[PDB]
Design a protein around this ligand. Structure first.
Ligand SMILES: *[C@@H]1O[C@H](CO)[C@@H](O)[C@H](O)[C@H]1NC(C)=O
Ligand SMILES: *[C@@H]1O[C@H](CO)[C@@H](O)[C@H](O)[C@H]1NC(C)=O
Ligand SMILES: *[C@@H]1O[C@H](CO)[C@@H](O)[C@H](O)[C@H]1NC(C)=O
Ligand SMILES: *[C@@H]1O[C@H](CO)[C@@H](O)[C@H](O)[C@H]1NC(C)=O
Ligand SMILES: *[C@@H]1O[C@H](CO)[C@@H](O)[C@H](O)[C@H]1NC(C)=O
Ligand SMILES: CN1CCC[C@H]1c1cccnc1
Lengths: 393, 393, 393, 393, 393
C-alpha cells in the first residue's frame, strides 16, 4: 500500500549494511543464538560425518530500523533480503561440507521496535568422532560449534538459548538422548580479544534390533558350530572339512561388520577381538588335527618323542582324564593284518586322546573368550537393560 | 514495439520489489498454490529420499502492475525476471537437497488485470519414511510440505488447489495411487503468528513382477530343497553336505534383499524373519545329524543316557511313530564281524529313528514358519488380489 | 576502433532487455530452433538417463539492433553477453539434471540486418524410457523436448529445422540410426494459449560384439553342460555334485546381466526367462535324482506305490522306451550276499529307468525353452541380419 | 600510491569491455594461445575421460590500455579482474565437465605497451577415445581442442605456440611421450566464416610393472595348470574336479580385467580372446572326460559305434600314436570277477587312449592359441623392448 | 552509531579496490602468510588426494584505511566484505578440487593503523604423491604450495610464518609428525620476474594397530598353514585339496590390500612381493605333487628317466637325506597281489622321497622369502620401535 511504500523508502535512507547497528559504539551488541533440530539425516562412520537438518535462530535489535505505528497504520513488520541490512556472521567451525557455509539465506523480519529475527534453514554436515569399540551398543556425542568469525567479545555479545526439539522426527536407527548447549569464551593466536562460542552436543544411542537380528543370531549359531567341531572327535573327513569351512567362511565374510567401522587405530570393537581369538583357536585346532591325522599314526610314542613336552602332557593327563596248509597260513597272515589294524587303532586311540586334550584346550580357551566378551557387552553401559527394554520390544 | 517499450518504462516507475503488492496494508494477500507432478524419478530406500519432477503453481494479484489495453494496443501480457518484482517465498520444509531450494527461476507472467502467474520447474529430493516391513507388497506415503518461510497468516493468505496429474508419465516400478493435499495452520516457537501450510501426500504402490520373478521362484525352490533335506534320511555324505551348503549359501547370499532396505530398527520384513527362522531350524538339523552320525554309533543307549530326556523321547515315540579248523574258525570270526556289522546297523536304526524324530520336529517347525509367512503375506493389504490382477498380468 | 565504440554506444541507447524485439506488438516473433548432436556420452539403464553433448541453434531477428554499414565502415557484426539483450527462454522439458538448465551461456552474434544467432553448448542429461526386454539386441528411442517456458503461440512462433549430424563422433557401444524432429502445439492447464514445442527423437541401436563375446559363449557352454548332466546317468558323486554346482553357480552369478537392467516390472528380458526356466528344470532334476538315489533303493515297487502315478508312468514307458562244511556254507552265504547285490542292482536298474524318464522330461522341456528363446531372438527385429552383418564383422 | 590511483582512474575512462580492442576495425586481432601441462590426474577408461591440470596462456595487445611511464613513475603494470576489460572467449570444444567451462578466472596483467597476458588455471575433464585392445601395452592419444566460440577468422586471428612441459610432474601409471599441437581452420553450418582452432594431442604410454606383477604371473601359473590338467590322465576324482575348478574360477574371476575396460564393441583385447579360447577348450575337455568316464566303460566299441567317426579316429591313431568243490568253484567265480575287472581295465585302456587323443587335441589347440597371443603381444608396438628396458627395470 | 557511520562514509571516499595500497608505488608491499591446520579429514590413496581443514592467515598494511581514534571515539576496528577493498590473490598451486579455489570468503578486519587481517577458512583437497611400498609402516610427506598468482617479487613481497597446530584434532589413522614451511622464489616462462612461494610439508605416520589386527594375524596363520602343507606328506586327498584351497583363496582374497593402493608402477609393496613369491612356490608344490601322485606310480625309475636330472637329484640326496589245490593257488595269487601292493608301496616310498625333496625345496625357499620380508619390515624405518612403543600400546 501507500504506507508500506513510504516506510520502505524511509527506512533505507542513509543506511549502511556495513555498520553495526548500535546507538553507542563503545558497547557490545547482544545477539541471542539458538538451534532447532528437525532430523538426523545420516551418521556416516566411514568418513565420520553427521548430517542433520537444522534451523538456526538469531535475534538482535537494530537501532535504525524503527518507526511509529500510528504514522504508518496497518504495517507492523518489514522483511529485508540478504544484502540489504546488517546480519551476524555466524559460522559452524567444525564443518565438513565442501562449502564452509551450508545455510539457505532467507529474509530478516523486523517489527516496529527494531527487533530483527533470522531463522535460516540448512542441512549441515559436521565432522564428529565416531566410536564403535562398543558396537552395536554405543552412545555417540557429536558437537556443533557456532560462533562469529570476525566479531570479538567487545563488539558482538553472543548469548545461548536452549535448543528446540518440539518438531523432531524420530530416526529409525538412532535414538536421541539430548542436545545440551554451552557458551564459552576462547582465545586465539589471531589477536588479543576473547571470542564467544556456542556448542551443542547431540547425543544419540543406536537401536540394536536390526543389527541384532542380522548378526547376533548367525554369530551365535556359528560359535555353537565351532564349539561342536571342537567337541567333535578327530577324523579325516568331517573334522578337517568343517574346521577349514568355518575358518575360511568366517575369515572372508566377517568383514561385513568391519565395512561399517573406521580404520582408526585407537581401540578395537569387542566383537572383532572375539572373532580374531576364536579364529586363532580354530586354526590351531585344525592344524593340530591334521598333524595327528596324517603326519604319523603308526606308533603311540610318535607325538611324545621329547621329554620336555612328554612330562607336561603326562601331568595334564594326570590332572584331566602242506601247500594248502601254507595258504591257510596266509589266511592266518591276513588275520595278523587285522591284528595290525587293531594295533593301528590302539595308536589312533592314543593319538586321539592327545588330540582330545588339545581339543579341550581349544574348547575352554574359546569359552573363556566368549565369557569375557559377553561380560564386557552385558555390564558395559549404565542402565543397559533399557536397550532390551526399549529397542528389542 | 513502441507501446511495449512505453509500457515497460511506465510499469517499473517507483516500483519496490520489497513491498508486498496490496492496496490495503491491513489485509492479507491471497495466494493460490498448487502442484503438477510429472515423474517419480527415484525412491531410494537406503537414504530414504524421494526424487520427483514437479512444476509449482503460484497465482496472485499485483495492485501496481495494471494498465489499460486501449492505451497500449496489442500488448496483453508482460513478463518479469527473478529480481524485478515481488514473489512469494514458498519453500519445501522437508527437503533433502544440499541446497534447500531446488527450483529453476523462470519469468513471472502478468496480464492487464495485474494477475501474476509463476510456474517454476524443479527436481525435488524430499525425505520421507520408507517402510519395507511388508516387502515386496508395500504402499508408501511420502509427504511434500510447502509454505511461506517469513510471511504469517495476517500477511500471506495461502490457499490450496488440487494437484495436476494429466501429464504424469507412469513409472515402471511404482504405481501411483493418488496425491491428495491438505492446508493447515501451524504455530511455531518463533513468534505469535499462525503460519499456513500445504501438504501433498504422494501415495505409491510397488510393482511386484520383477522382484517376484527374481526372488520368489528361487526362494520357493530353496525352501523345497530344505524340506527335502529335512525329509532326507540321515547320512554322512549327502545329508551333511547339503545341509551345510544350504546354510552357508543362504546365509551369505540372502543379503541381496537386505541391501535394498534401511537399517531402521522399527520392524522386520516378514521375508527376513522367515529366512532367519528356517536358518536356525536347518542349523539345528545339521548339528544334530552330525552328532548322531559321528559322536557315537556303537550303542543304542548312547543318546538316551539321561532319564529326563529319555521319558520325553519315549512319550514322543508313543505319540508319533586242527590248524585248518582254527583258520576256518577265523572265517567264522569274520562272519561274527559281519554280525557285529548287523549290530552296528541296529544301533544305526535306533539312532536314525531318533534323528528322524528330530527331522520331523525341524520339518513341522519349518512348515509352521512358512504357513505364518504366507498367511501374513496373503491377507496383508486390503484388495490384495489387485496386485496379481494388475501387476503379474 | 572508433566506429566500433560509437556503434556500441549507439546500439544500447534506450534498449530494454525485457521488451520483445518486434516492430508490431500484435504479431508473433518467428524463432528458428535446431540442434547439433556431437556425442552420446552415456546411456544409463539403472537410472534411465541419456547424457549427450549438444549445441542448440536459435535464430531470430531483432528490430532495434540495426545499423548502416557505410556509416560504420569495417564493423559488420557485434556480440552481446547474456544479460544485455533479449533472448528466448528455451528449456528442455524432460530434464534429469539437478539444475533444470544445463547450457553454457555464450555471446549472441548480430549482423547489420539485426539477425541474431545463438549457439550455446551443453551436456544434457534427459530422462528417457529404457527397454531391455530384447537385450542385447535392442533399439532405443529417447526424446528431447524443447520449448519456450513463458511465451505462447501468439508471442513466440517456434519453428523447426533438421538436426545436424555432420560432426557426430561415433560411439563404441551404440549405433545412431537417426534423429528426426517434430513440431507440435500443446494445451496446458495454465491458461488459454497454445504452446509450440519441438521434439527430437534420438534412435540408437546397440553393438552386440562385446556383450556377445562376454555372455553368449559361456551361456552356450553352461547350457550344453546342463544338457549333459540331464543326459548323464543318475549317480551319487558326479550327477548330484554337477547339478548342485550348476544350480548354485548360475543362480548366484547370473545377476551380472541383471545389474545392467532396471527394476521396471513392465516386461522380462528373454534371457532371464530362459535362465529361470532352465533353473527350475535343473532343480527338479537334482531333487528327483536325490530322491531316487538315497530315499529308497531296496525294492522296485518303492516309487510306484500309488496306482494313480503308476498308470501314467506305465503309459509313458509304453509310449517311450561238518563245521568246515558250515563255514563253506557261510562262504555260500556271502555268495548269496553278492546275489542280493545283484537284486539291488536290478532295483537300481528299475529306479534308473524311472530317473531316465524324468531326465528325458527335463531334457526336452529344457530344449523347448531354448528353442522358444532362440526363435524369439532370431526373428525379433526387422532386418536382424544387419547386426551379424555389421556388428560381429 | 598517487600515480597508481590516477592511472587507474584514467584508464577506465570511456572504456567498453564489449568492444574489441583494435585501432582499425577492418583488421583481425592476433591472439597467441598456448598451454602448460602440470599433471595427468586421471585416465578413466569406464567413462573414457582424461582429467588433467592445465594453465592456459593467452597473449594479445590492447590499444586503449597504454600510458607513458615518465608521467606515472614507478608503475609498470596494472591488473584487471574478470568483467572489467575485454578477454577472448576461448573454450574447450570436447569437454566432459557438467559445466562447459572449467577455468578459474584470474586477473589480466597489462604493461605500459598495452600487452595483455592471461594465464587461468584449471582442471579439465575432456572426452577422448580409450583403446585397450592392446592392454596392458597400449599408447593413448587424447585430444584437447581449443577455440574461440563466437569470433571468426576475420575478427580474431588465433595463433599457436608450443606447449610447456618444464613443470610436469611424472605420473606413476602413464608415461608422457609428447604433446604436439596443430592449428587449423574449420567451416561450420552456422555461417560463412572460417574458424581457427588449436588442438593439442597428449600422448601417453602405460607402465606395465604393476599390472604385470598383478596379472601376468597368476595368468601364466593358471595356464600351466590347465596344460597339466590337459596332460593329466583321465580319472574321476582329480581330473574332473581340477577341470571344473579351473573353468568356474577363471570364468568368474577373470572379470577383474574386464572391469577396467569399456563396453565398446570395436575390438577385443587379446588377453580376453585368449581367455575365451582356452575356456572353450577346457570346457570341451571336461565334458568329453565326463562322457568317457561315466557314460559307458563296459565295451571298447562303445565310443566308435559310427563308421564316419571311426574312420577319422583310426586315421588319427595311425598318424599319431562236492559242495566244498562248488564253493571253491565260487572262489573261481570271484577270480573270474577279477578277470572281468581286467576286461574292464582293457576297456578303460581303449577309452583312455581315445581320451588322450582328445586331450592332445585340446593341448595343441591351447598351445596354438597361446602362441598367437604371445606373438601378437611381443611384436605389437614398434620399439617394444623399451617397456622391458624402462618399465620393468 | 554516529561515529561508525561517519567513519564508514569517509573511508570509502575515492577508494579503488583495484589499486595496490602502498604510499610509494616503486616499493613492494609486504604480506605475511601463515597457515593453521585443524584436521586431516582424508588421505585417499586410490586418487592420491589429501583433504584437510585449514585456516589461512594473511596480514598486511593498507595506507588509505587509517583514521584518528580521538576523532571517532569508541570505534577501533572496521570490517570490509569480499569486493570492497584490495586483497591478495593467494592460491594453492597443486589443487585437486573441481574449482581451483576452495576458500570461504569472510570479512577483512582493519584497525586504526591500517593493519588488515584476513583468515578465510577452507577444506582443501590437494594432490600429493602417496607411497605404500612400505605399507603398513609408512611416512607420507604431502606438500601445499601457496603463492600469488599475478603479483611478482617487485610488487608483492611474500613472507612466511610458522604454522599453527595448537587447535589440531588428532586423527585416528594418521599421526602428525610435523608441518614445516619454506619460502622460495621461482622463475616461470610467463615473463621476467621472480615469484615468491610458500610451501608447507605435512608429514604423517600411519597407525598400524587396526591394519595389524586385520591383516597380520590371518596372514601369519595362512603362512603357517602353507608351511604345514609343505611339510605334510604327499597324499591324494588332504595334500592336494589343502594346496588348491590355499592357492585359490589367497589369490582371490588377497586383493583387499591391493584395493587400498594405487596402480603406480614405481615400486611394489613388500607384502605383495612376499604373497606372490609364496604363491609361485605353493603352485609349484601342488603341480609337482599331482604329477608324482597320478602321472606315474608303478615304477621307481619313472621320475628319473633322464640322466641329466638323475645326477643332480642323486647329488642332492647324497647332500640331504587238484582243482581245490589250484583254487588255493589262486589264493596264493591274491597273496601275490598283496605282494604287488607292497611293490607299489615301495614305488610310492621312492616317489615320496622325491616329493619330500621337492617339498623341502619349497619349504626353505618360502622361509627365505619370509626372512627377507621380515628383515625388510623390521629394520626399515629409523626408530621403528616407536610404532610398537606408541601405536600397539
Ligand atoms: C506516533 O504518532 C502519533 C500521532 O501522530 C503520536 O501521538 C505519537 O506520539 C507518536 N509516537 C511517538 C513515539 O512519537
Ligand atoms: C482505456 O482507454 C480508452 C480510450 O482512451 C478509454 O475509453 C477507457 O475508458 C480507458 N479505460 C479505463 C479503465 O480508464
Ligand atoms: C548508408 O550511408 C550512405 C552514406 O551516408 C548512404 O548513401 C546510404 O543511403 C545509407 N543507407 C541507408 C539505408 O540509409
Ligand atoms: C613521456 O613523458 C616525458 C616527460 O613528460 C616526455 O619527455 C616523453 O616524450 C613522453 N613519452 C611520449 C611517447 O609521449
Ligand atoms: C587526533 O585527535 C586529537 C583531538 O582532535 C588530536 O589532539 C590528535 O593530534 C589527533 N591525532 C593525529 C595523529 O592527528
Ligand atoms: C514459519 N517460518 C518458517 C520456519 C521459521 C519460521 C520463521 C519465522 C520468522 C522468520 N523466519 C522464519
Amino acid at each position: 500500500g501507500e504506507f508500506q511504500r513510504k516506510l520502505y523508502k524511509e527506512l533505507v535512507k542513509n543506511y549502511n549494511p556495513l555498520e553495526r547497528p548500535v546507538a553507542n559504539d563503545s558497547q557490545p551488541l547482544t545477539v541471542y543464538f539458538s538451534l532447532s533440530l528437525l532430523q538426523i539425516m545420516d551418521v556416516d562412520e566411514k568418513n565420520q560425518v553427521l548430517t542433520t537438518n537444522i534451523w538456526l535462530q538469531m535475534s538482535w535489535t537494530d537501532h535504525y530500523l524503527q518507526w511509529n505505528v500510528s504514522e504508518y497504520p496497518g504495517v507492523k513488520t518489514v522483511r529485508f533480503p540478504d544484502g540489504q541490512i546488517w546480519k551476524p556472521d555466524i559460522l559452524l567451525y567444525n564443518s565438513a561440507d565442501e562449502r564452509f557455509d551450508a545455510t539457505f539465506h532467507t529474509n530478516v523480519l523486523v517489527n516496529s521496535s527494531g527487533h530483527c529475527q533470522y531463522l535460516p534453514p540448512g542441512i549441515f554436515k559436521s565432522s564428529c568422532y565416531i566410536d564403535v569399540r562398543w558396537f552395536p551398543f554405543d552412545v555417540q556425542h557429536c558437537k556443533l560449534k557456532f560462533g562469529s568469525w570476525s566479531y570479538g567479545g567487545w563488539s558482538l555479545d553472543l548469548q545461548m538459548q536452549e535448543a528446540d526439539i518440539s518438531g523432531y522426527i524420530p530416526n529409525g536407527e538412532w535414538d536421541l538422548v539430548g542436545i545440551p548447549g554451552k557458551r564459552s569464551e576462547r582465545f586465539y593466536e589471531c589477536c588479543k580479544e576473547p571470542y564467544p562460542d556456542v556448542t551443542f552436543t547431540v547425543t544419540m544411542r543406536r537401536r540394536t534390533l536390526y543389527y541384532g537380528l542380522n548378526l547376533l543370531i548367525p554369530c551365535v549359531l556359528i560359535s555353537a558350530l565351532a564349539l561342536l567341531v571342537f567337541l567333535l572327535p578327530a577324523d579325516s573327513g568331517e573334522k578337517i572339512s568343517l574346521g577349514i569351512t568355518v575358518l575360511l567362511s568366517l575369515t572372508v565374510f566377517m568383514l561385513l561388520v568391519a565395512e561399517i567401522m573406521p580404520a582408526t587405530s585407537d581401540s578395537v570393537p569387542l566383537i572383532a577381538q572375539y572373532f580374531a581369538s576364536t579364529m586363532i583357536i580354530v586354526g590351531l585346532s585344525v592344524v593340530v588335527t591334521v598333524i595327528v591325522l596324517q603326519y604319523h599314526h603308526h606308533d603311540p610314542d610318535g607325538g611324545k618323542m621329547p621329554k620336555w613336552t612328554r612330562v607336561i602332557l603326562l601331568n595334564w593327563c594326570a590332572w584331566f582324564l602242506p601247500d594248502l596248509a601254507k595258504i591257510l597260513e596266509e589266511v592266518r597272515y591276513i588275520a595278523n593284518r587285522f591284528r595290525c589294524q587293531d594295533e593301528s587303532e590302539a595308536v589312533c586311540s592314543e593319538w586321539k586322546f592327545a588330540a582330545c586334550v588339545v581339543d579341550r584346550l581349544c574348547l575352554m580357551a574359546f569359552s573363556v573368550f566368549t565369557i569375557i566378551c559377553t561380560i564386557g557387552i552385558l555390564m558395559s553401559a549404565p542402565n543397559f537393560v533399557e536397550a532390551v527394554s526399549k529397542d528389542f520390544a
